[PDB]
């Protein structure tokens, strides 16, 4: 039985509104309703991995696992294995996989982050799951961010707190947060970003939804506008939204949006909004294609409709040669030429690089680079041809071209990362000097750039 080079992943996000689900939720796992939906001809075909994120979940882990497994079994006649379940308050993530994947999945991690202080600490935050599927690292974050149209700044802060403090993936990758730790990272939930239009426009918005005319609404979506000004989810992707706002509905129908202010809302309007979202970030030049993104029409127990997204995701096998793992393959080398970092920092310390990759026995520290002053104010850190020669554990080009090098630039004085990025080894040529580039981030904010040339030697 050959190891797969592709898997499909189902991502679900549902704010259940503290109500039990209805008896049938199969439409969710089948990607049926509104938006980019799944072909009918695929209905009996199981996804490899189902990741289910809930918010305001009133069920026990036991109660929800029984409904999920029975749902997938009715759809597929396959009995799914539980990989992981983690709950913080009423925020839950469940990971289910086909039984044939049980021995492909290892290094399962779960964590949570509680956002806010005193007043604002008590029910918002994120749960997460990571694991290895053969040679590919996968991370999943379900977040319930701060509610309310006037708290987009708070939501952006909630995001930064989750990506700094969620402890998933390989702890040896110490300079790197979850936005660099995974081949594929999926981040979903009730992100709670609203359509920022005047309250007096509520009926006009409802009219536009009934005409399936979403363009004017999406142009005011706070998550789209915050992302365009690089305030949040920098370097993440989202599929185009072609489904009605998923919040806020009257329960037991989908025919009415309940937007007017009420004691129960803290006298806040809830204009129809895309609260419920799926974004992803994969390493450069890895296959990832969104094959569905939409909302169900027939699950009406909550004031939110469930959202689904499915993805094709590139995966690699666990490689073993005569040499690595457990030694170097003298045939392989990675060389960096004419390299420099450009940093936004106002500081003056010396900087060195760290190279981290699963293709190395352990991370590699460079010599300090030479600081110069950029023509527009910037710090430029020159490495020239000084960077060490990296010694991969395996030289086979079928392995090595599928790998990535994570880069941290660190202060010599403090050993703190000023910037993190990622370089793909999926080059156009081997034994050839080729341009490389990555932006650099710290705490998910843009802090600089790394550029230069690479020269990759494989056994071919
Ligand atoms: C890493 N993805 C980038 C691609 C370029 C455009 N883009 C975007 C799209 C809509 C709203 C705001 C930003 C991104 O996020």
């Amino acid at each position: 039985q050959p190891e797969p080079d592709m898997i499909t992943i189902f991502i679900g996000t549902w704010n259940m509104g503290n109500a039990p689900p209805p008896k049938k939720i199969t439409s969710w796992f089948l990607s049926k309703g509104q938006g980019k939906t799944r072909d009918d001809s695929a209905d009996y075909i199981p996804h490899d991995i189902y990741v289910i994120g809930t918010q305001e979940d009133p069920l026990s882990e036991k109660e929800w696992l029984e409904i999920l497994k029975h749902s997938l079994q009715e759809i597929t006649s396959v009995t799914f294995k539980t990989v992981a379940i983690h709950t913080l308050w009423n925020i839950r993530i469940v990971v289910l996989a086909k039984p044939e994947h049980e021995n492909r999945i290892s290094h399962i991690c779960t964590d949570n982050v509680k956002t806010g202080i005193a007043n604002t600490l008590g029910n918002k935050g994120a749960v997460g799951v990571s694991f290895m599927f053969n040679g590919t690292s996968l991370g999943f974050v379900n977040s319930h961010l701060t509610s309310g149209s006037e708290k987009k700044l708070r939501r952006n802060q909630n995001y930064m707190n989750i990506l700094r403090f969620l402890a998933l993936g390989d702890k040896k990758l110490s300079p790197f947060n979850i936005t660099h730790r995974f081949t594929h990272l999926f981040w979903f939930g009730d992100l709670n970003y609203r359509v920022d239009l005047p309250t007096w426009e509520a009926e006009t918005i409802i009219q536009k939804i009934k005409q399936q005319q979403y363009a004017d609404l999406l142009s005011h979506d706070q998550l789209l506008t915050e992302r365009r000004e690089q305030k949040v989810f920098l370097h993440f992707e989202e599929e185009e939204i072609t489904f009605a706002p998923t919040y806020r509905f009257e329960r037991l129908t989908r025919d009415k949006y309940a937007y007017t202010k009420q004691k129960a809302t803290g006298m806040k309007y809830n204009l129809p909004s895309w609260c419920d979202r799926v974004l992803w970030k994969s390493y450069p030049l890895v296959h990832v294609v969104c094959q569905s993104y939409g909302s169900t029409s027939d699950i009406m127990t909550s004031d939110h409709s469930p959202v689904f997204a499915t993805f094709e995701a590139g995966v690699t096998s666990q490689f073993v040669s005569k040499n690595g793992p457990g030694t170097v393959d003298s045939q392989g080398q990675i060389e960096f030429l004419r390299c420099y970092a450009t940093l936004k920092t106002k500081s003056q310390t010396k900087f060195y690089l760290e190279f981290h990759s699963s293709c190395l026995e352990s991370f590699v520290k460079s010599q300090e680079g030479e600081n110069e002053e950029g023509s527009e104010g910037e710090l430029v850190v020159k490495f020239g041809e000084t960077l060490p020669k990296l010694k991969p554990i395996i030289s086979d080009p079928e392995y090595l071209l599928d790998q990535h090098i994570l880069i941290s630039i660190k202060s010599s004085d403090s050993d703190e990362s000023y910037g993190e990025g990622c370089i793909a080894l999926r080059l156009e040529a081997t034994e050839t000097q080729l341009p490389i580039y990555t932006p650099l981030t710290h705490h998910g904010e843009l802090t600089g750039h790394f550029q230069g040339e690479i020269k990759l030697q494989t056994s071919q």
Side-chain angles (χ1 to χ4, degrees), residues 58-105:
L59 302 184
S60 69
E61 285 191 349
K62 174 173 176 160
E63 285 166 339
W64 189 221
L65 267 172
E66 198 186 330
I67 290 154
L68 290 177
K69 289 199 170 204
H70 284 156
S71 297
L72 293 187
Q73 181 145 82
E74 183 162 295
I75 288 159
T76 69
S77 294
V78 170
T79 301
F80 274 78
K81 294 286 187 180
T82 305
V83 175
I85 179 163
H86 192 68
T87 307
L88 164 68
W89 294 316
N90 296 114
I91 309 156
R92 181 173 290 144
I93 186 163
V94 184
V95 182
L96 300 181
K98 295 187 63 192
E100 65 202 68
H101 296 326
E102 189 179 343
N103 300 295
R104 293 177 172 132
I105 291 162

Side-chain angles (χ1 to χ4, degrees), residues 224 227-228 233 235-237:
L224 293 185
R227 272 177 27 79
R228 213 176 264 282
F233 282 102
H235 300 144
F236 282 74
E237 303 296 327

Side-chain angles (χ1 to χ4, degrees), residues 2 17 44 78 91 109 119 124 223 225 232 279 348 388 410 416:
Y44 303 151
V78 170
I91 309 156
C109 303
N119 263 233
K124 296 311 196 280
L223 181 54
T225 64
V232 84
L279 300 88
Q348 274 289 357
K410 285 165 129 207
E416 60 189 325

